[PDB]
Coordinates of C-alpha atoms and ligand atoms in Angstrom, one line a residue:
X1 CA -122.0 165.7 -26.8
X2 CA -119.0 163.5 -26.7
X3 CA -116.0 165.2 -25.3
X4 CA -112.3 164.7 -26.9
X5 CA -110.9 161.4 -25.3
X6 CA -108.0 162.5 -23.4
X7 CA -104.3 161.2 -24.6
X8 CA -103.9 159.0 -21.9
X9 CA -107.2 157.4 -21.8
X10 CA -107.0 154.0 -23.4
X11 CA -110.1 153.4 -25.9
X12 CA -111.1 150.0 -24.2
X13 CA -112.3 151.9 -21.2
X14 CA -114.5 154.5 -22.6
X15 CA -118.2 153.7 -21.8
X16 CA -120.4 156.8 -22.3
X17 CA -122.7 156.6 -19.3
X18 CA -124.4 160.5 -18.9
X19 CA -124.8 160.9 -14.6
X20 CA -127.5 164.1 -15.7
X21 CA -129.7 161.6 -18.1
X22 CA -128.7 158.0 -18.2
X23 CA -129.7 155.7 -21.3
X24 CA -131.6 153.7 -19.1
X25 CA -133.5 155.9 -17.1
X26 CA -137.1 154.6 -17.9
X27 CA -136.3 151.1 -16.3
X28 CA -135.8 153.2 -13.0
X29 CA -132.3 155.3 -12.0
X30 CA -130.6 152.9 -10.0
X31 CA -131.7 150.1 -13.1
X32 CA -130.4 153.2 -15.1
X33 CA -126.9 153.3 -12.7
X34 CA -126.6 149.4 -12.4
X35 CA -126.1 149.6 -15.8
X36 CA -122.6 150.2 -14.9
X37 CA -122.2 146.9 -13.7
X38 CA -122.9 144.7 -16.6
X39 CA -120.2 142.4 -17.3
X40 CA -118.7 143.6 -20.0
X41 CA -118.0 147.0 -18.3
X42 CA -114.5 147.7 -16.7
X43 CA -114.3 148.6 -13.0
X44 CA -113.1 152.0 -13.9
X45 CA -114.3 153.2 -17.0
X46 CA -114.5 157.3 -18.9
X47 CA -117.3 158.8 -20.1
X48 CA -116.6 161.1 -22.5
X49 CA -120.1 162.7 -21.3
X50 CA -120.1 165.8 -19.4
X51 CA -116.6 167.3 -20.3
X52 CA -115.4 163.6 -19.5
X53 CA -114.4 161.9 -16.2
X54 CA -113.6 158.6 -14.9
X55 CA -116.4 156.5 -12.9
X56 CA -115.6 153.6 -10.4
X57 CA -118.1 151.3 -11.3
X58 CA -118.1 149.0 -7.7
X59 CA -117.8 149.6 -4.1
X60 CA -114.3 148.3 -3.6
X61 CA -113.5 151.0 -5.6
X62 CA -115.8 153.7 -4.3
X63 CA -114.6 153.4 -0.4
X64 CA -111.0 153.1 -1.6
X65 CA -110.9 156.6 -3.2
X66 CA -113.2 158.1 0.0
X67 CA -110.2 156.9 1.6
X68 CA -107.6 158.3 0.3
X69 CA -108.1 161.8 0.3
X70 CA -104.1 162.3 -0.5
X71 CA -105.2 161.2 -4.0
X72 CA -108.6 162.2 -4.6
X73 CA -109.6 165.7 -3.5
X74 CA -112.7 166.9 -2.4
X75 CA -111.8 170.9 -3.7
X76 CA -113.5 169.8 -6.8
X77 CA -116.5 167.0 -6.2
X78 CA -119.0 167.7 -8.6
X79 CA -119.2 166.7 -12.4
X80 CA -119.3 169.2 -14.7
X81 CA -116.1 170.7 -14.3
X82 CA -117.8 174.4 -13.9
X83 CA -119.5 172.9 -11.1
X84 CA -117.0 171.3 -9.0
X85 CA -114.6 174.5 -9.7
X86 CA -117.4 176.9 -8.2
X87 CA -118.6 174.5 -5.6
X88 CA -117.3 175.6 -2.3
X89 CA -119.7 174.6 0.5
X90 CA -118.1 173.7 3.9
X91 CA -116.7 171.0 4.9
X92 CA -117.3 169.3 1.6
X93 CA -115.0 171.3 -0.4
X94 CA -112.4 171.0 1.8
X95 CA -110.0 168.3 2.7
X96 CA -108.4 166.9 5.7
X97 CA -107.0 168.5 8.2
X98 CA -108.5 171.5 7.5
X99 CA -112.0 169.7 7.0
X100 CA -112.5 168.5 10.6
X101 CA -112.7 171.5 12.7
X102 CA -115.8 172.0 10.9
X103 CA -117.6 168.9 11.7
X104 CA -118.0 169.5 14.9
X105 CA -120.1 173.2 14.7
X106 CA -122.6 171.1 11.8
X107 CA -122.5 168.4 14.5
X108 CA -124.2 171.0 16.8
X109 CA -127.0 172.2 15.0
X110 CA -127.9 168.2 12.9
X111 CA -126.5 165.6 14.9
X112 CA -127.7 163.5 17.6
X113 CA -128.7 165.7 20.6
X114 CA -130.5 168.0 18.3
X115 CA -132.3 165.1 16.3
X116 CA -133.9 164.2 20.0
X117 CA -134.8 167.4 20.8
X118 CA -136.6 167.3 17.6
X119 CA -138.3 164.4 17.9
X120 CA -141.6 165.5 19.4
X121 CA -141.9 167.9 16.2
X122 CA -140.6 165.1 13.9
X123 CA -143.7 163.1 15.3
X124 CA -146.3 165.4 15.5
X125 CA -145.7 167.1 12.3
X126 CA -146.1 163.4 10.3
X127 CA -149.0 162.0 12.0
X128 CA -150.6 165.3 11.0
X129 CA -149.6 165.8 7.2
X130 CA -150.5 161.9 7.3
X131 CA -153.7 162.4 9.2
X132 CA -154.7 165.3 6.7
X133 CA -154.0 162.8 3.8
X134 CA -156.1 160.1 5.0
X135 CA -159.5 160.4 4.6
X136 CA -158.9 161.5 1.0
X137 CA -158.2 157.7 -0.8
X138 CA -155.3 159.8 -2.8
X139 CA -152.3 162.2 -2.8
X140 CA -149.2 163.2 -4.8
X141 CA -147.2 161.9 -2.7
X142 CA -144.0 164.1 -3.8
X143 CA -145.8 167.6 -2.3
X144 CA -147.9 166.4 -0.3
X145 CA -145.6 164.6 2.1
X146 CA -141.9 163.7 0.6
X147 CA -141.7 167.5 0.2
X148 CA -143.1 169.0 3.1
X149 CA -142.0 167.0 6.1
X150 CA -138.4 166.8 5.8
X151 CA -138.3 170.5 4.5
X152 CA -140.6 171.8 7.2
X153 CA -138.4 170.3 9.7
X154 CA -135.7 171.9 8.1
X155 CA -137.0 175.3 8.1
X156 CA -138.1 175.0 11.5
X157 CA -134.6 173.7 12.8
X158 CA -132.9 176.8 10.6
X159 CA -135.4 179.5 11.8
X160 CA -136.5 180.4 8.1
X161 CA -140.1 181.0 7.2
X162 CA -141.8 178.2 5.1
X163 CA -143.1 181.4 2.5
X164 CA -139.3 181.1 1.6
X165 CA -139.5 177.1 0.3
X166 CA -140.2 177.4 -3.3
X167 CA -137.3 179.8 -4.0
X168 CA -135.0 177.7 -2.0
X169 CA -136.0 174.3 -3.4
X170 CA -135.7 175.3 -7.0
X171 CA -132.4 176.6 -6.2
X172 CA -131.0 173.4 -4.5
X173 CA -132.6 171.7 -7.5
X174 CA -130.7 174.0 -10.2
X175 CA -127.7 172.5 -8.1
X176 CA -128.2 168.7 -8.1
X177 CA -130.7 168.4 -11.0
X178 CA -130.3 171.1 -13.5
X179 CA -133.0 172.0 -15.7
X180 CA -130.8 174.2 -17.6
X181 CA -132.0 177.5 -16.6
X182 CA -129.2 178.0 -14.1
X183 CA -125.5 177.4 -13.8
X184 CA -124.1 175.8 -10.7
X185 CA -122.3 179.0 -9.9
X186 CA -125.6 180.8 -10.2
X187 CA -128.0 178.9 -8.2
X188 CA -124.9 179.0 -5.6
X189 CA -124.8 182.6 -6.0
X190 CA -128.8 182.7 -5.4
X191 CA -128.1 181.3 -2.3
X192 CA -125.6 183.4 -0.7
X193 CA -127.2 186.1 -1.8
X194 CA -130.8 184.7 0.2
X195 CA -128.2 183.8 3.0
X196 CA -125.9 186.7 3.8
X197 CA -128.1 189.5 5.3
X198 CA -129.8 186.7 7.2
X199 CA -126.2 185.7 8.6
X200 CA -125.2 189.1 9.0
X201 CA -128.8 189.9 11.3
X202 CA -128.0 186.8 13.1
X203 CA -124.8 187.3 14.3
X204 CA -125.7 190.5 15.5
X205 CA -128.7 189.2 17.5
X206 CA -128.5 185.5 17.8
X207 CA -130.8 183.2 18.2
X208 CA -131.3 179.2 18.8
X209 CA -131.5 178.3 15.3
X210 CA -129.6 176.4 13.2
X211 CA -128.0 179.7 11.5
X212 CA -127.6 181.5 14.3
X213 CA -125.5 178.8 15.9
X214 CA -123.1 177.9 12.5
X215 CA -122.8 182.2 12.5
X216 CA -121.9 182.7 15.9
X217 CA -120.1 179.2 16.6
X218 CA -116.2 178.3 17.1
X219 CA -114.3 176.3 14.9
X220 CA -111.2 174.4 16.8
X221 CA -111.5 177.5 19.5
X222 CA -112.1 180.2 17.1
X223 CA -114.5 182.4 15.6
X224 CA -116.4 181.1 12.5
X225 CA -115.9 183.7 10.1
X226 CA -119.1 185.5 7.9
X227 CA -118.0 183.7 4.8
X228 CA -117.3 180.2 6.3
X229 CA -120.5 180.4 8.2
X230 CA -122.5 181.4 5.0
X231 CA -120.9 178.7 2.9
X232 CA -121.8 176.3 5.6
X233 CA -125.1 176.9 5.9
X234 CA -125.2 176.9 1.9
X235 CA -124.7 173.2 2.6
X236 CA -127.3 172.5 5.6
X237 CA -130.1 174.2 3.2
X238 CA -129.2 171.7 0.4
X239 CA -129.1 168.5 2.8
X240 CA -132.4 169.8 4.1
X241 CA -133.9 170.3 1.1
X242 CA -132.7 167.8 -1.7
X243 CA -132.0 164.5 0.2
X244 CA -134.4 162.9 2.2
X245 CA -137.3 164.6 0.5
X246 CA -136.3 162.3 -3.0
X247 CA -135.4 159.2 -0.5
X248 CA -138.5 159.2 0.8
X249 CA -140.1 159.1 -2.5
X250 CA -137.8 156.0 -3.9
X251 CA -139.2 154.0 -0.7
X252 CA -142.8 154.9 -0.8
X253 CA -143.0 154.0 -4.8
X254 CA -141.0 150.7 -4.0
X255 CA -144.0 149.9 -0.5
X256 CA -147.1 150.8 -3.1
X257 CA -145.5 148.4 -5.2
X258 CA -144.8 146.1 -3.2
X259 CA -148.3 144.7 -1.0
X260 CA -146.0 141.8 0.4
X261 CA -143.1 144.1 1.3
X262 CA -145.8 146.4 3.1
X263 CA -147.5 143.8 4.9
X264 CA -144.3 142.4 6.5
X265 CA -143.6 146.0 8.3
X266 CA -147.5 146.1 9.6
X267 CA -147.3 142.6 11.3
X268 CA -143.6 143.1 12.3
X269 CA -143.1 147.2 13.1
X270 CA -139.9 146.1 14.9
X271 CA -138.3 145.7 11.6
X272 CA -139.0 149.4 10.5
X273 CA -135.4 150.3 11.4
X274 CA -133.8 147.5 9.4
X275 CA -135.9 148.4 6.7
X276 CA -135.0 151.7 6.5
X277 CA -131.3 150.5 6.3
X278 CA -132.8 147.8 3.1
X279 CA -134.3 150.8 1.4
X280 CA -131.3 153.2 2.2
X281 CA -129.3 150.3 0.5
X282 CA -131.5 149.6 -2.4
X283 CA -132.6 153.3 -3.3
X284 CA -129.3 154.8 -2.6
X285 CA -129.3 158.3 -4.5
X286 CA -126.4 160.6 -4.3
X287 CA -123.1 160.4 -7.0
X288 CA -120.5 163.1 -6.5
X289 CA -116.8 162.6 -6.4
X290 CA -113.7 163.8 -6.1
X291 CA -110.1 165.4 -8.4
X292 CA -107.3 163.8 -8.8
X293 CA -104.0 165.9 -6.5
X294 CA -101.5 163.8 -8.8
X295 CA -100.7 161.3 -11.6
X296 CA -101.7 158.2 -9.8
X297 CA -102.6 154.3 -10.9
X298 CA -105.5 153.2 -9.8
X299 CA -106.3 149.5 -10.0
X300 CA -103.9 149.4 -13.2
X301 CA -105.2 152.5 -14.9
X302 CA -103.4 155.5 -15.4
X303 CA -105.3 158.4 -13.5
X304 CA -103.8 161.8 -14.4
X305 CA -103.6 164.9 -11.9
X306 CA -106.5 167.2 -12.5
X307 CA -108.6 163.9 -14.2
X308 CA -112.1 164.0 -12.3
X309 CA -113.3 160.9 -11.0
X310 CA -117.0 160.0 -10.2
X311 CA -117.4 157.9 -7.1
X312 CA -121.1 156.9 -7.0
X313 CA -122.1 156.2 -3.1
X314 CA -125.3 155.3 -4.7
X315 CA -123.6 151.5 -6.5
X316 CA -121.6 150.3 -3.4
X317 CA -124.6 148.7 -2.0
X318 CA -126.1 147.9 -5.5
X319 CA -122.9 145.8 -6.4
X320 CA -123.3 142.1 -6.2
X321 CA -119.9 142.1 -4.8
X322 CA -120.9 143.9 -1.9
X323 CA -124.3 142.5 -1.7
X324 CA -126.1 139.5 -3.2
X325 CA -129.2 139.9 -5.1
X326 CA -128.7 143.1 -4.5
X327 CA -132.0 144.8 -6.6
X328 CA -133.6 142.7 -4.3
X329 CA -135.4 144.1 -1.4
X330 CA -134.8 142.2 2.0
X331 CA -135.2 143.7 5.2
X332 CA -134.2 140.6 6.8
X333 CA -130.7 140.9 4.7
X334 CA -127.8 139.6 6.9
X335 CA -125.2 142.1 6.4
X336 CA -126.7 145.4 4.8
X337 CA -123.7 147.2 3.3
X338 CA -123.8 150.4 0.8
X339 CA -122.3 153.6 1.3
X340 CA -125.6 155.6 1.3
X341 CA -124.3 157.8 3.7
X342 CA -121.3 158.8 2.0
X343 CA -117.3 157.2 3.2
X344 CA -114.6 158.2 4.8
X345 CA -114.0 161.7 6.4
X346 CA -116.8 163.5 5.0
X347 CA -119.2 160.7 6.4
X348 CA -122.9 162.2 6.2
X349 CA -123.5 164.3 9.6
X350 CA -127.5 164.6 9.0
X351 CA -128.2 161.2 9.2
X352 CA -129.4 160.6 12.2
X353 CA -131.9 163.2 10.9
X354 CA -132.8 161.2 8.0
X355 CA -132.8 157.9 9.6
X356 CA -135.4 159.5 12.3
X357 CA -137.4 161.0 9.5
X358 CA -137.2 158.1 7.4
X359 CA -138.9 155.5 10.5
X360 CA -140.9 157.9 11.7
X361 CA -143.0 158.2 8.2
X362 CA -142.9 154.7 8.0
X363 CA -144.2 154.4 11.3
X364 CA -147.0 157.1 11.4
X365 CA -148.0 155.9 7.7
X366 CA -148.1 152.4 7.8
X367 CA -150.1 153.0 10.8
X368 CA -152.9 155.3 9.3
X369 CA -152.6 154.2 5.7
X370 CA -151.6 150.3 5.8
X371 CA -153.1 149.2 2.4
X372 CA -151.9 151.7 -0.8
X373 CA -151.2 151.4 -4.3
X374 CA -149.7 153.3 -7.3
X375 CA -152.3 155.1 -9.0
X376 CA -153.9 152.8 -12.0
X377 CA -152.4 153.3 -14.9
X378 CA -150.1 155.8 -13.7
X379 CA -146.2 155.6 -15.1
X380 CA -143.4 156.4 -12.1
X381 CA -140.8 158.6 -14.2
X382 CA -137.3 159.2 -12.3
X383 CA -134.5 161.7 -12.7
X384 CA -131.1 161.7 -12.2
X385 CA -127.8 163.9 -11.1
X386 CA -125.8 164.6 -7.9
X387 CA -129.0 163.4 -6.4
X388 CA -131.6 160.9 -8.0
X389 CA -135.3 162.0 -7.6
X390 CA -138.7 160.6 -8.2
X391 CA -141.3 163.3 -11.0
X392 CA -144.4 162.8 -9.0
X393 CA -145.7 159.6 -7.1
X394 CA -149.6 159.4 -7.5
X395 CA -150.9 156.9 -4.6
X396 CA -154.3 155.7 -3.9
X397 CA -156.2 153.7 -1.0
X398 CA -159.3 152.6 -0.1
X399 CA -160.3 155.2 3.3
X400 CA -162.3 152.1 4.9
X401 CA -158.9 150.6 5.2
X402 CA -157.4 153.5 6.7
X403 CA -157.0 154.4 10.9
X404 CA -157.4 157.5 12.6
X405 CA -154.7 157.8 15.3
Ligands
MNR501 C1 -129.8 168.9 7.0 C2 -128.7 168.1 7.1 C3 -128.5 166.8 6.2 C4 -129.4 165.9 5.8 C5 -130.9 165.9 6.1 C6 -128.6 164.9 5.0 C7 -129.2 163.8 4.4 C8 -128.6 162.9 3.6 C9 -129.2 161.8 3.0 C10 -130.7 161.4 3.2 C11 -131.2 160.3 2.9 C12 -128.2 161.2 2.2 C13 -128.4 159.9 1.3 C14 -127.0 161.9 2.3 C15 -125.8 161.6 1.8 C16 -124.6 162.3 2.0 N1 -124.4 163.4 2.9 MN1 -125.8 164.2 4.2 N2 -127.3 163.0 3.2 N3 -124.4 165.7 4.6 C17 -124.7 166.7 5.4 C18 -126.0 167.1 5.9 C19 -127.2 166.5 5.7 N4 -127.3 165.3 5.0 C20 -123.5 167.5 5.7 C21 -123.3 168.7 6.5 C22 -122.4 166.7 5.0 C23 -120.9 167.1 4.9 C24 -120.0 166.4 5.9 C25 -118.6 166.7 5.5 O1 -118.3 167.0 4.3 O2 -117.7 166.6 6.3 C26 -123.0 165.6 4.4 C27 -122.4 164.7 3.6 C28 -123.0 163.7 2.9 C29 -122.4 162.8 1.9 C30 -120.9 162.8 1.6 C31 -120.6 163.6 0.4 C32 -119.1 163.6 0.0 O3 -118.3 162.8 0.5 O4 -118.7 164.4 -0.9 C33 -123.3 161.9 1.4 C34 -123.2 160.8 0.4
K502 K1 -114.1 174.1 -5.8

């Protein structure tokens, strides 16, 4: 339903556009997004979907109000309201200054140095999902790989038992993709309560896992307390489980699709990274956003304090402003620029895990499986919400095609 345009919202800008269930979803989501940037459609427009917000509809936009965290606030970056009021994960509920001296401890346990240590583990648990796959001409490629790799590297990395991923995934999902069965503020609450005795047990008797470290680390010189150590590793559990795992998806549709696209990486395997950075671009899949800390005009409209403003990272690198042709796919694309990652302060710290797990499955797949396909006749449906997802992805090869390494 349609909520009550707001006094100061002028009529001429109200395009209806639902984030939780675009109109044109069955085109694919970021068709369904794009939509957006049709030429009648303002660069800021208000849905009066979802309680009503604005939306910044291209990436001049987008990286201007990442910017300028004075104006738009991170203390409330989710759409529905409910959600972004109960929403208070660390650091990305929280603004600068008091943001930053977080960064570093998340740093520790997902950046860089860890991502290396990793990536024997990365490696060797792809070439043998892969491997497993091969000889069978066929998998769903949503649990059978997009699912298990990334959240099996996860759950490694955070010391938690892989008996544990079903309840953990459907609660991440309740937070990004609602089926209705769960608030926000619920599926939050679900995970604290999975988290805290495990936080508790861990500070007591640390480990060299990922919670261990966030529960017993320093932030700017001090201790981490329980509760900012819980409602940081409330975040790490979501970027482990409900990123990367769709991502992969997006790509691996796009490559069955695509025997041209597929055939470029097998003769030319330097180009995996760039490609990577192409599909990052192309299947960008995360929208959140940010509340307005004042009365503030905005590109000649008349934000008011409180307003909520959605700030897709997912159309930066879709808008033909940014990049030509952009729902083209070209990994030899000159200058690659989208804001998959997020922008700004709160800059995404896993991504040198994703990139790492993105190139390593192309890699280790493209090595084994070279030659796939779509199922016949089967329909790819998407969904959409904080972050875009693929149903199920039914692939199929020939096994006389395929490599054992
Ligand atoms: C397990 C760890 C993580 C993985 C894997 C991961 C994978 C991915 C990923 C995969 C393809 C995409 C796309 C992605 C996208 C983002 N990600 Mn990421 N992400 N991601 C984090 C951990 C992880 N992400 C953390 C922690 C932050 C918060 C940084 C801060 O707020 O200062 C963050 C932030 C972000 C933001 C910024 C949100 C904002 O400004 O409100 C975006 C966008
Ligand atoms: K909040």
């Amino acid at each position: 339903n349609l909520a009550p345009l707001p006094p100061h919202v002028p009529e001429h800008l109200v395009f209806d556009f639902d984030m939780y269930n675009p109109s044109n979803l069955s085109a694919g989501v970021q068709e369904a997004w794009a939509v957006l940037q049709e030429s009648n459609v303002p660069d800021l427009v208000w849905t009066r979907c979802n309680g009503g917000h604005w939306i910044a509809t291209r990436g001049q936009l987008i990286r201007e109000a990442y910017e300028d965290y004075r104006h738009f606030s991170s203390e409330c970056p989710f759409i529905p309201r409910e959600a972004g009021e109960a929403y208070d994960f660390i650091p990305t509920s929280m603004d600068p200054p008091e943001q930053r001296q977080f960064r570093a401890l998340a740093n520790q346990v997902v950046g860089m140095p860890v991502v290396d240590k990793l990536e024997n583990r990365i490696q060797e648990l792809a070439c043998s999902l892969i491997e497993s796959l091969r000889p069978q001409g066929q998998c769903n490629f949503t649990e059978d790989y997009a699912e298990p790799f990334p959240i099996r590297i996860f759950m490694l990395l955070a010391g938690l038992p892989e008996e544990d991923i079903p309840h953990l995934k459907y609660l991440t999902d309740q937070m990004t993709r609602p089926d209705g069965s769960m608030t926000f503020a619920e599926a939050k609450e679900a995970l604290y309560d999975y988290l805290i005795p495990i936080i508790e047990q861990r500070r007591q008797k640390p480990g060299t896992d990922a919670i261990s470290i966030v529960a017993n680390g320093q932030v700017n010189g001090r201790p981490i307390t329980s509760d900012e150590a819980k409602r940081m590793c409330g975040l790490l559990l979501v970027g482990g489980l409900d990123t990367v795992v769709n991502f992969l998806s997006f790509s691996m549709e796009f490559l069955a699709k695509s025997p041209e696209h597929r055939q470029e990486l097998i003769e030319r395997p330097e180009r995996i990274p760039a490609a990577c950075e192409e599909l990052l671009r192309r299947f960008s899949l995360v929208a959140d956003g940010r509340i307005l800390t004042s009365d503030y005009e905005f590109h000649g409209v008349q934000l008011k304090k409180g307003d909520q403003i959605l700030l897709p990272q997912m159309l930066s690198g879709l808008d033909e402003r940014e990049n030509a042709c952009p729902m083209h796919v070209d990994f030899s694309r000159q200058k690659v620029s989208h804001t998959t990652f997020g922008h700004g302060s709160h800059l995404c710290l896993g991504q040198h895990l994703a990139r790492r797990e993105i190139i390593v499955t192309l890699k280790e797949w493209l090595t084994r499986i070279p030659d796939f396909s779509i199922a016949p006749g089967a329909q790819i449906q998407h969904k959409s919400g904080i972050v875009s997802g693929v149903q199920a992805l039914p692939l199929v090869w020939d096994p006389a095609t395929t490599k054992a390494v």
